[PDB]
Amino acid sequence: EVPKEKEKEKVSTAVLSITAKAKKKEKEKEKKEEEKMEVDEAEKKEEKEKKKEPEPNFQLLDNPARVMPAQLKVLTMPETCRYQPFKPLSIGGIIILKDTSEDIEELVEP
Amino acid sequence: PLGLGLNHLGKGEAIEAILAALEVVSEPFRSFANTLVDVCAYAGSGNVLKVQQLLHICSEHFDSKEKEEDKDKKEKKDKDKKEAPADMGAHQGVAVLGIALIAMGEEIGAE
Amino acid sequence: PLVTPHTQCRLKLLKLERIKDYLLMEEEFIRNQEQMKPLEEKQEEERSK
């Protein structure tokens, strides 16, 4: 959702007449006013660069799971979880879980 | 605001604009007075850099009936600073205001 | 028609650069005139038919 919001808003004033020396002596007028009374303003860098690089590539998924037919081979069961599947899980479709221990819960239907 | 500019007529020092416009820092229907004491100090000389800010800031904008008085009064101050470079700019003034105004304009021209 | 030094003098340098100033501004005023017109019209039914 990015339709537009554009603005014509200006035509740049290209007056390269006597304005050129007129603006230059005005910049001299700020060299008495800016650096001699008060100036301090700053902002911080590299905050927005920081959050990008520690990213995933280990995205967990529930099992209503969309999966590209390209990424069938790069998905991995949780070996730290005990419940392992039955068929070699490298191709999309339907497989069954080999439920190991005890205390099965968390069924969901809308 | 007119007697203000009559009290500060005829000096191209541009301190009187720093005096008056920073004094009546206010809503834009009171900033109609911004153009008055600015150019009432600007009776006659060549200060063409003022004449471009006399055009470029409020030029047209199509302006559906809000500040239409201000562009008229901005044009009102274009009328002087034109009546005494001794006809050097009077030919240029009739060249501009005949063309891009009444022959290319709106409430600014035809009112 | 007031270029009255008629010679190599700084007046005619000053005179003609004034004339350059008023013609560039009259260019830039009409340039802003066809610029800042948001209209985007829709024709009347009687005129369009």
Side-chain angles (χ1 to χ4, degrees), chain A, chain B, chain C residues 1-41 45 48-49:
Chain A
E1 194 271 326
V2 274
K4 188 54 70 176
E5 182 65 33
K6 66 174 74 69
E7 293 295 325
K8 300 284 101 174
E9 181 68 28
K10 277 176 72 173
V11 177
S12 64
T13 62
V15 181
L16 296 177
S17 297
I18 62 175
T19 67
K21 65 100 177 180
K23 61 98 178 179
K24 186 262 291 180
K25 66 183 178 66
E26 182 66 30
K27 299 285 102 175
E28 191 271 331
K29 293 179 182 180
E30 296 294 326
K31 299 287 102 177
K32 185 174 170 64
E33 295 292 326
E34 292 291 327
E35 65 183 1
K36 299 286 102 175
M37 288 74 167
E38 182 66 30
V39 50
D40 45 350
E41 186 174 359
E43 185 64 28
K44 185 58 69 178
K45 192 258 295 177
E46 72 186 1
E47 186 178 2
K48 278 78 178 174
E49 191 270 331
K50 183 63 69 177
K51 65 181 71 65
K52 294 181 181 180
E53 59 186 1
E55 67 181 1
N57 66 3
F58 60 103
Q59 285 84 14
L60 292 174
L61 293 171
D62 295 330
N63 55 1
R66 58 97 57 217
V67 60
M68 188 179 293
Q71 59 174 357
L72 301 176
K73 66 182 178 67
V74 298
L75 59 93
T76 307
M77 67 186 76
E79 64 183 1
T80 181
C81 181
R82 189 176 170 87
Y83 293 161
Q84 294 181 357
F86 185 71
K87 188 179 287 293
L89 188 63
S90 297
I91 185 163
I94 184 167
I95 48 95
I96 69 104
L97 182 69
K98 186 176 181 180
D99 186 77
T100 59
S101 296
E102 186 63 28
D103 199 2
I104 51 97
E105 294 296 326
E106 301 294 326
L107 272 300
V108 57
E109 290 180 354
Chain B
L2 268 296
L4 292 173
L6 293 177
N7 207 170
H8 291 290
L9 192 143
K11 68 279 290 181
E13 65 180 6
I15 286 97
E16 296 296 330
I18 302 301
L19 291 177
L22 297 175
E23 191 176 3
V24 202
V25 281
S26 62
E27 61 92 18
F29 292 161
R30 292 180 293 175
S31 296
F32 173 79
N34 194 4
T35 182
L36 272 307
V37 192
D38 191 6
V39 201
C40 284
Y42 292 156
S45 292
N47 58 6
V48 186
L49 281 76
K50 186 267 303 171
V51 188
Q52 63 184 356
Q53 71 182 357
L54 188 69
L55 290 178
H56 287 295
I57 282 89
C58 52
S59 298
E60 298 88 6
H61 297 83
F62 181 75
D63 195 64
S64 295
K65 280 79 176 176
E66 291 179 352
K67 69 179 77 66
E68 289 293 336
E69 296 85 3
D70 185 74
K71 288 183 260 72
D72 294 331
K73 186 60 71 177
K74 186 71 72 65
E75 181 60 38
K76 178 68 175 67
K77 308 307 287 296
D78 187 76
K79 301 173 171 63
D80 52 351
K81 194 58 79 183
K82 189 180 286 187
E83 59 92 19
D87 194 69
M88 182 62 69
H91 293 291
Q92 298 296 323
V94 302
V96 171
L97 302 185
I99 326 246
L101 187 298
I102 190 63
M104 260 9 174
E106 107 178 3
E107 202 275 336
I108 296 97
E111 300 279 328
Chain C
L2 199 278
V3 292
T4 180
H6 292 166
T7 186
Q8 294 297 318
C9 182
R10 194 181 176 274
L11 283 172
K12 282 172 69 176
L13 182 58
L14 290 176
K15 286 178 174 65
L16 295 176
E17 288 176 353
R18 292 294 303 271
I19 302 169
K20 182 180 256 74
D21 288 331
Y22 291 106
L23 267 78
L24 284 171
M25 286 170 61
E26 188 177 1
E27 182 183 5
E28 292 296 326
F29 182 75
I30 195 169
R31 183 66 176 171
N32 290 317
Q33 185 175 4
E34 292 102 16
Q35 185 63 257
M36 298 177 186
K37 293 287 104 174
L39 269 297
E40 296 294 327
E41 59 90 20
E45 183 179 0
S48 64
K49 290 183 179 179

